[PDB]
């Protein structure tokens, strides 16, 4: 009956309430404690909903639709749930009045169909008009970096961010291809950009002062087995009773390891990397041959080495082929932060890069690293899609405006339903002002003043509270996000309103 | 006690009232494995739900008759049988025994089934044309995922035409098969990217360096049931470990024996080896040099239907490539379906096969489950297209249920005796079908009902009926006011579905009304 | 036991034991053609529990 429908309304509001403070770059962050007892803090709606694992069917629908928003698009996972859940509150008083939810869901199909048509009209394709090649991507990075602690140092940060995208093919871009390694301690403005891949360098064992940071053309080869002979698991027991035989029964094992020398020595690989920690056995002979070795390397950073110089992983040292080797242009190692950092530079075949970040504390860089990810998506989608729309409240207000005029010509219950859907579009700009500190009541009244003057581009300024146009604020958003957000929010809402009774079997 | 059995079903009666129809509602049922499963078909939901009430099981067993023997009417039998219990409360309150109630339905059943022969105007010629099959398949695919019935109609109509072989003037040998059509689903893509392919699409990885074979026709395919391993002896032949000297013969022995078995197979021209069980590591290295595609089928249910497509036969032994057990396929390629590279299995002209696969694409995982199950229910109605009244049809969507009311009330005063009370209540029980269609569509109950009576009841000075008897229950939500001809959208209920559902609905309510006492134990 | 070096040699030893069944099938098929073999409206059915 209608009792379970009302219970599904509050279930969507409870999930929406957690994602309200996380909307926007200046929004608040949520703290969720996983069963693994690991602290996870993120403002992105995808990761938030994936860690909740809610048993409620309607609340899980908002979680499942967030994965579809992150798959086909990857941006707007927080706003798609807030918009989908807002329809549950607007349709709550309509159920008590006798209006069925089926006519409410029917009005959304006609409202979204007319809204998508208005998105293409607001999207203007511009590339070389009033813009250059270098200054195009630089002005987009300063938008997401505004109202942040890095705003003073953002001059040096944009130059390193643009070079990360240009270092890869503009046809295929991925945010996972750009790596970031946090460096505790040091000045923020002293960070540099690296063309190759780097790792954390957790190797604490001795044999330092050699393998200098200056290399010419080192050869890279992947390693599988362990170089050390120490057996961690198995063992053996053999004992003799002869007194004079105690001499040589302590002696010879490592001579068997010499069998793997000539195979590796004739290869000439100057870089030794593996997914297992390198032992304490030989740190020297490699340095005599100008061969470098680094142990305790994570498995995630080993896959980037294969895509860099074109290496390969072989189990033994016998069948290793000579053409699997690769070399970089230059090597660099920095001791800043009381820790050595190994990084490769000048790899022409590298499909990945690494950007180092420095700061006062580790928690300070965590806010800088995540604030950069929002700027990378704006720079990445600029070259991929040439159709962009004005964001920051601009597009969200006009989509709700056109539905008010078109509803006047429509007769029946669909008039108040489209007007309710248009009113439901005001939750997106609301939380953006409340999370940024601005009063949502005063802006909502003042923004609708110039919004009726015939200009559809008026947005909301995120720096200083005021009404105006985001065109001067350099706030750009792609058209694929606004189109897929209305379809994903409506489809997820139609499935919840179409289920009157919830049945859960235990077993 | 007879009221408690009806009240327990009445609480579950409203669940099935929202099933039938495109504007209805669906129920979310959490499976015992921790997976949310939702579907429109009630026969599937009743199997997942655990109900110890035997009175409910009477309607569940009657629902399986609509799911198995027919491809449509699972939601209709639950509405008709549930309404017969509510209208029977008026006769029980007056003091009428259950004998005249059951006898009244039996007398009204023969009167209804006799009039169904006159309800058929047009007859399907069974042309099996792509455009002609869209008339019967559309109403079966409908009432699920409303709005997608236009695109999904071409997928089923084209797949059924591929299953039916070309023949004329022969109705003795059956043609269509239900299990020969398997539907696949992959996350990603859109609905417009779907197509119709003849074969069984394999979503498994190629497992080897050979992605696809050449374009030459009649590729030799070998299906091996025994897994790939070193050749052993059928009698005893147990390999054990004793001394380290035999360890070298175990590794080096498997290299020479497996390479010798694969050489004799490649010499005969076999480009494909199908292994139903696991494949060893050493076997994948030899198949790369001989140019043999690696294909694994872990499901033993697909091996029986594969013999009727390519023509290959499973071999319980290994190393004996008998040419009589080898099949032939024209085209084997590798295409990207849903974003991943998969090996496609299809053909062109020769070796006509009855196995077809409808490829589906979409972002939502739950929406792909209903569309996949709707195709199985859509192709199941093809079996009902045979000689036993497969061409006869009747207008649906509330057109027939209202028209039959005028014929039942005419026979009420004609038949003397106590049966007059059961005949009048027999026609009233059919008013629940058009009422649920108006409630789920948002229309008022006081609107659609009086408009249907005035449309089918007119004063015509003549014997031959005029105007239109095809007026159904309109969803409205568009145009201006009133209803429209249901024949314009080519939506109708097949007579084999409606006529067979009447006999099931009467027997379902007869058992409940005939049981005046129940005895169970606490569980 | 079955001793074979190659898979082709296994069919020679396996068919040796199958000749016992094929020898009895030759006498069964001869009974059909012996009595009303070519006569119409005739049949031969094997129960074989």
From Swiss-Prot, chain A:
One of the record's GO cellular component terms: cytoplasm
Superkingdom assignment: Eukaryota
CDD domains in the record: TCP1_eta
The keyword Cytoplasm is assigned to this record: yes
Main location group: cytoplasm
Keyword Transferase: no
An example Gene Ontology biological process: protein folding
Record function comment: Molecular chaperone; assists the folding of proteins upon ATP hydrolysis. Known to play a role, in vitro, in the folding of actin and tubulin. In yeast may play a role in mitotic spindle formation.
Subunit details: Heterooligomeric complex of about 850 to 900 kDa that forms two stacked rings, 12 to 16 nm in diameter.
Family membership noted in the UniProt record: Belongs to the TCP-1 chaperonin family.
Record's protein name: T-complex protein 1 subunit eta
Swiss-Prot record, chain B:
CC annotations in GO: chaperonin-containing T-complex; cytoplasm
Keywords recorded for this protein, A-Z: ATP-binding, Chaperone, Cytoplasm, Isopeptide bond, Nucleotide-binding, Phosphoprotein, Ubl conjugation
InterPro entries registered for this protein in UniProt: Chap_CCT_theta, Chaperone_TCP-1, Chaperonin_TCP-1_CS, Cpn60/GroEL/TCP-1, GroEL-like_apical_dom_sf, GROEL-like_equatorial_sf, TCP-1-like_intermed_sf
Any Pfam family hit: Cpn60_TCP1
Gene3D superfamilies, sorted: GroEL, GroEL-like equatorial domain, TCP-1-like chaperonin intermediate domain
Subcellular location, record wording: Cytoplasm
Protein name: T-complex protein 1 subunit theta
Gene name per UniProt: CCT8
UniProtKB/Swiss-Prot annotation, chain C:
Lineage top rank: taxon: Eukaryota
Regions that span the bilayer: none
Localization terms from the record: Cytoplasm
Quaternary structure and partners: Heterooligomeric complex of about 850 to 900 kDa that forms two stacked rings, 12 to 16 nm in diameter.
Family membership: Belongs to the TCP-1 chaperonin family.
Function: Molecular chaperone; assists the folding of proteins upon ATP hydrolysis. Known to play a role, in vitro, in the folding of actin and tubulin. In yeast may play a role in mitotic spindle formation.
Protein name per UniProt: T-complex protein 1 subunit zeta
Portion of the full sequence shown: 250 to 298 of 546
């Amino acid at each position: 009956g209608k009792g379970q429908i009302i219970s599904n309304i509050n279930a969507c509001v409870a999930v929406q309430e957690a994602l309200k403070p996380t909307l926007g770059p200046l929004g608040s962050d949520i703290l969720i404690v996983t069963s693994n007892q690991k602290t996870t803090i993120s403002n992105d709606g995808a990761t938030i909903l994936k860690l909740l694992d809610v048993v409620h069917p309607a609340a899980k629908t908002l979680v499942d639709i967030s994965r579809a928003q992150d798959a086909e698009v990857g941006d707007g996972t927080t706003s798609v749930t807030i918009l989908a859940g807002e329809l549950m509150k607007e349709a709550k008083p309509f159920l008590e009045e006798g209006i069925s939810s089926h006519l409410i869901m029917k009005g959304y199909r006609k409202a979204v169909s007319l809204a998508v048509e208005k998105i293409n009209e607001l999207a203007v394709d511009i590339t070389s008009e009033k813009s250059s090649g270098r200054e195009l991507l630089e002005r987009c990075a300063r938008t997401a970096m505004s109202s942040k602690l890095i705003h003073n140092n953002a001059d040096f940060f944009v130059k390193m961010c643009v070079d990360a995208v240009l270092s890869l093919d503009r046809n295929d871009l991925d945010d996972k291809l750009i790596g970031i390694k946090k460096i505790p301690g040091g000045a923020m403005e002293e960070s540099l950009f690296i063309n190759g891949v780097a790792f954390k360098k957790t190797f604490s064992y001795a044999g330092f002062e050699q393998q200098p940071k200056k290399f010419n053309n080192p050869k890279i080869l992947s390693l599988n087995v362990e170089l050390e002979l120490k057996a961690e698991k198995d063992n053996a027991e053999v004992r003799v009773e002869h007194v004079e035989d105690y001499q040589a029964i302590v002696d010879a094992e490592w001579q068997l390891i010499f069998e793997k020398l000539r195979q590796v020595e004739e290869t000439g690989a100057n870089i030794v990397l593996s997914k297992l920690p390198i032992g304490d056995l030989a740190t020297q002979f490699f340095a005599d041959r100008n061969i470098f070795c680094a142990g305790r390397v994570s498995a995630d950073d080993m896959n980037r080495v294969i895509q860099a110089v074109g290496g390969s992983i072989q189990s033994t040292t016998s069948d290793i082929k000579p053409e699997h080797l690769g070399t970089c242009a230059l090597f660099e190692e920095m001791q800043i932060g009381s820790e050595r950092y190994n990084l490769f530079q000048g790899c022409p075949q590298a499909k990945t890069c690494t950007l180092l970040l420095r700061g006062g504390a580790e928690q300070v860089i965590a806010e800088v690293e995540r604030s950069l990810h929002d700027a990378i998506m704006i720079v990445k989608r600029a070259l991929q899609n040439k159709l962009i729309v004005a964001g920051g409240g601009a597009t969200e207000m006009e989509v709700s405006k056109c539905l008010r005029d078109y509803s006047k010509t429509i007769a029946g219950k669909q008039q108040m339903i489209i007007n309710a859907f248009a009113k439901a579009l005001e939750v997106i700009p609301r939380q953006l002002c409340e999370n940024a500190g601005f009063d949502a009541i005063e802006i909502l009244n003042k923004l609708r003043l110039a919004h009726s003057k015939g200009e559809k581009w008026y947005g909301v300024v995120f720096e200083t509270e005021n009404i105006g146009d985001n065109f001067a604020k350099f706030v750009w958003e792609p058209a694929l996000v606004k189109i897929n957000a209305l379809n994903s929010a409506t489809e997820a809402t139609n499935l919840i309103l179409s289920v009157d009774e919830t049945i859960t079997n235990k077993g | 006690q007879i009221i408690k059995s009806i009240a327990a079903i009445r609480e579950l009666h409203q669940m099935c009232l929202t099933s039938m129809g495109p504007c209805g509602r669906n129920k979310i049922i959490v499976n015992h494995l921790g997976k949310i499963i939702i579907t429109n078909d009630a026969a599937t939901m009743l199997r997942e739900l655990d109900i110890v009430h035997p009175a409910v099981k009477v309607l569940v067993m009657a629902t399986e008759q609509q799911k198995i023997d027919m491809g449509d009417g699972t939601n209709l039998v639950m509405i008709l049988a549930g309404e017969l219990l509510n209208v029977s409360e008026k006769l029980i309150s007056m003091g009428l025994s259950a004998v005249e109630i059951i006898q009244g339905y039996n007398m009204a059943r023969k009167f209804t089934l006799k009039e169904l022969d006159e309800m058929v105007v047009g007859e399907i010629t069974d042309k099996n044309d792509k455009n002609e099959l869209l008339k019967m398949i559309k109403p079966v695919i409908s009432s699920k995922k409303y709005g997608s019935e236009d695109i999904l109609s071409e997928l089923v109509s084209e797949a059924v035409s591929h299953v039916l072989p070309v023949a004329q003037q022969a109705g003795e040998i059956p043609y269509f098969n239900v299990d020969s059509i398997r539907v696949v689903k992959i996350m990603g893509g859109s609905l417009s990217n779907s197509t119709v392919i003849k074969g069984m699409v394999f979503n498994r990885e190629p497992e080897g360096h050979v992605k696809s074979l050449s374009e030459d026709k009649k590729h030799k395919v070998a299906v091996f049931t025994c897994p790939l391993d070193i050749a052993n002896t059928e009698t005893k032949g147990t390999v054990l470990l004793h001394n380290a000297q035999e360890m070298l013969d175990f590794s080096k022995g498997e290299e020479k024996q497996i390479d010798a078995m694969m050489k004799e197979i490649a010499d005969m021209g076999v480009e494909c080896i199908v292994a139903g069980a696991g494949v060893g590591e050493l076997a994948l290295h030899y198949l790369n040099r001989y140019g043999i595609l690696v294909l694994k089928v872990p499901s033993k249910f697909e091996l029986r239907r594969l013999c009727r497509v390519c023509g290959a036969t499973p071999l319980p032994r290994l190393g004996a490539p008998t040419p009589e057990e080898l099949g032939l396929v024209e085209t084997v390629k590798t295409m990207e379906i849903g974003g991943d590279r998969v090996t496609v299995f299809k053909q062109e002209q020769g070796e006509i096969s009855r196995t077809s696969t409808i490829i589906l694409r979409g972002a939502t995982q739950n929406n792909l489950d209903d569309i996949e199950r709707a195709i199985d229910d859509g192709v199941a109605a093809v079996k009902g297209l045979m000689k036993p009244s497969g061409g006869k049809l009747l207008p649906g969507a509330g057109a027939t249920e209202i028209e039959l009311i005028s014929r039942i009330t005419k026979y009420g005063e004609r038949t003397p005796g106590l049966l007059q009370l059961a005949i009048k209540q027999f026609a009233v029980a059919f008013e629940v079908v058009p009422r649920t269609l108006a409630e789920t569509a948002g229309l008022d109950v006081n609107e659609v009902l009086p408009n249907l009576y005035a449309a089918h009841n007119v004063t015509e000075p003549g014997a031959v009926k005029t105007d239109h008897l095809y007026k159904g229950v309109d969803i409205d939500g568009e145009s201006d006011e009133g209803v429209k001809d249901i024949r314009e959208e080519n939506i109708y209920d097949m007579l084999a579905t409606k006529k067979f559902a009447i006999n099931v609905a009467t027997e379902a309510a007869t058992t409940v009304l005939s049981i005046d006492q129940i005895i169970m134990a606490k569980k | 036991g079955f001793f074979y070096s190659s898979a082709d040699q296994r069919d020679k030893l396996a068919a040796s034991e199958r000749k016992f069944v094929d020898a009895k099938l030759k006498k069964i098929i001869d009974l059909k053609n012996e009595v009303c073999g070519m006569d119409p409206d005739k049949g031969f059915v094997i129960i074989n529990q």
